[PDB]
């Protein structure tokens, strides 16, 4: 599930809420 953050140049600030960079945007479990 996309969270609402891009990660093309820098990692997900939303890692705090469980989101990780996949395919240039931040996702939690798809």
Numbering used by the authors: 1 to 30
Sentences from the paper on this structure:
Cyclotides are a large family of topologically unique peptides characterized by a head-to-tail cyclic backbone and three interlocked disulfide bonds. This combination of structural features forms a cyclic cystine knot (CCK) motif and confers cyclotides exceptional stability. Cyclotides are divided into three subfamilies: bracelet, Möbius, and trypsin inhibitor subfamilies. Since cyclotides were first reported two decades ago, studies on bracelet cyclotides have been hampered by their low synthetic yields because of poor oxidative folding efficiency.
We found that when the loop 2 Ile is mutated to Gly, bracelet cyclotides could be folded with high yield, albeit with loss of activity. The negative effect of the [I11G] bracelet cyclotide mutation on lipid binding was expected, as the mutation reduces surface hydrophobicity, a previously reported determinant of membrane binding. [I11L] mutants exhibited similar or slightly higher cytotoxicity compared to their parent cyclotides, whereas the [I11G] mutants had substantially reduced or no activity, which correlates well with their membrane binding. Having determined the crystal structures of wild-type cyO2 and hyen D, we were interested in definitively showing their Ile-11 to Gly and Leu mutants have native-like structures to support our earlier NMR chemical shift analysis. Like the case of cyO2 mutants, [I11L]hD and [I11G]hD structures only exhibited minor differences in the mainchain and sidechain conformations, confirming both Leu and Gly substitutions are well tolerated by the bracelet fold.
